[PDB]
Structures are given as structure tokens and as C-alpha cells.
From a paper:
Mitogen-activated protein kinase kinase kinase kinase 1 (MAP4K1) is a serine/threonine kinase that acts as an immune checkpoint downstream of T-cell receptor stimulation. MAP4K1 activity is enhanced by prostaglandin E2 (PGE2) and transforming growth factor beta (TGFβ), immune modulators commonly present in the tumor microenvironment. Therefore, its pharmacological inhibition is an attractive immuno-oncology concept for inducing therapeutic T-cell responses in cancer patients. Through its proline-rich domain, MAP4K1 binds to a diversity of adaptors in hematopoietic cells, including those involved in T-cell receptor (TCR), B-cell receptor, and cytokine-induced signaling. The function of MAP4K1 has been studied most extensively in the context of T-cell activation.
Protein X-ray crystallography confirmed that the urea moiety interacts in a bidentate hydrogen bond with the Asp101 side chain in MAP4K1 (Asp112 in the surrogate kinase MST1). Ureas synthesized from cyclic amines, which reduced overall H-bond donors by one (not shown), also displayed more than a 10-fold decrease in activity, highlighting the importance of the two hydrogen bonds for overall potency.
Author numbering: 23 to 38, 42 to 298
The structure:
Amino acid sequence: TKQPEEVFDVLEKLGEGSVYKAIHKETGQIVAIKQVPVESDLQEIIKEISIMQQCDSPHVVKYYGSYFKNTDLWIVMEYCGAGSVSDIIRLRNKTLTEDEIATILQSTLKGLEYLHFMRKIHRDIKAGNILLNTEGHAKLADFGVAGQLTDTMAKRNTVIGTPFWMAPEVIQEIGYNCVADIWSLGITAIEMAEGKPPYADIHPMRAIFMIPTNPPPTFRKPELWSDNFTDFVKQCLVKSPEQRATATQLLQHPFVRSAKGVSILRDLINEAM
Ligand SMILES: COCCNC(=O)Nc1cc(F)c(Oc2ccnc3[nH]cc(-c4cncs4)c23)c(F)c1
């Protein structure tokens, strides 16, 4: 009920909808505030907030609430100071090591296990939608295209996501379920190792045509990568969604199961900031 500027001291812009770092003045907690015009298209803003409000997981970006200020909507969220994994790759101009990827994807998979239990499908898993806080904890972000299964709707059939990362069953007319995110996770693993997903240099509308017919992608330089990492990607990129591994099962994959603690990401985060 209080004016947003009395609750929050807005600091630096982080992004440009438009995102600001801010201090919650009563607790000293740092938050991220997304500001959008109330007259803008709010379709995915409304979707993403509805999904985040239903989530309570250390592996999913928290939503704290919304204010009107003048003719803007302020969306208050958990602050992830290291930014996205794709930001960290770009800023350091370096791909991630196997150990760094195992640690990030362990936390990503715990977030997917939580969403999938709640019958949610992220549908836009990619390095750009995995954020790190300054302590190195990975959180799922951008729920703007997330789907919800129900008692009466056991499958979604909307062709939606970001083409290079989309599962074959999502692209094809057939309905699909939570394990579409596991395919996207496999593409994300390659993206973190190589800096870009398979087919990154071809037209996205051409790539979407080939993903359903092509064999599962593999590493560009297979000799660089352990048997465990190679097998982890192969298991994620099983074309049959019925056969594809779940988040729970991949948390036991040898690539993920022995991931190092978030300390392995300290150098990484320091360099990026
Ligand atoms: C030059 O290339 C583009 C530059 N990259 C970039 O601007 N990255 C970026 C990443 C983010 F994660 C950003 O957003 C955040 C930031 C921190 N902590 C958050 N907590 C929550 C967010 C979210 C906001 N939008 C949806 S979640 C958030 C952002 F604004 C910008």
C-alpha cells in the first residue's frame, strides 16, 4: 500500500523490459525491479508473474510483488547479481569447463524437478534463462512461455520456445509434457560447452524444420569432452519423449551426481563482475 520509491531505493540499470538493481529500505535486501509501461503488451509479463508467484524453490527466481508508479508497472524479484550464464560466457569471452557446467546443471535440474512435480513446463530453457546470484546459485528465469498440465490437460501442444532449443515433439503437431525441458537442457549443456547451440549459424525457421528429422546433435569437437559429459548430453537428447530421462533420473547421472559445490563458480563470477 506504500509508494514504491518509499520502499525501494532504485540504483543502477541492469537491462534494457527495463530492469534496475534496488534496495528494500526496511531490510537492506538487494532486489531487481523490472519496469514496464502499463500501456505496453503485458501478455508474457502476466504469464511469467502468475508462474513465479506459484513457485517456492531456491532454484527458481522469486517474485516479491508489483507496484504502479506514475504510468509504469514495477515488478520486484530476487536479485541474481552475476546475470545469466550466457552473459557470463560473453563477458569472460570463454565457454564453461565440465565442472562449472555440472554444478550449474545440477541446480538447473533441481529447479526442473520442482517445476515438473508442479506439472509446469518452462519451455524456454537456455543459458540466457539461467541466472546466477553472487554466491553462485543458479535459478530458472523467464517463465513468459511456460505451460501448465492439468487433470484434464495431460499434454500441451503449443509450438513454443526458442527454435534452436525446442524439442522435436514440441515442433511436431503432437502434444508433449515436462520432458520437453530435458531436451532443451541438453541443447543448453552444448551451448555452455561451445558458446552457442547446434545450428546457431543457420536461419532459425530453417533449423526448426530440421530438428524433428535430424539425428540428436552431438559436440562439435567430441574429443574435448569426458565419457560422462558425452553420455549426459546423449540422454538429454533422446528423440523419443516417452523414453527420455526425467530431471529426477538425470540428478543421478554420473556427470551431475558428483558436481562440485558452488565454490567452483567463485573465480567465474568474480571475473564476470
Ligand atoms: C549486451 O548483452 C545484453 C546484456 N545482458 C543483460 O542485460 N542481462 C541481463 C540478465 C538478467 F538476468 C537481467 O535480469 C535480472 C538481473 C538480475 N537479477 C534478476 N532477478 C530477476 C531478474 C529478471 C529480469 N527479468 C525477468 S527475471 C533479474 C537483466 F535485466 C539483464
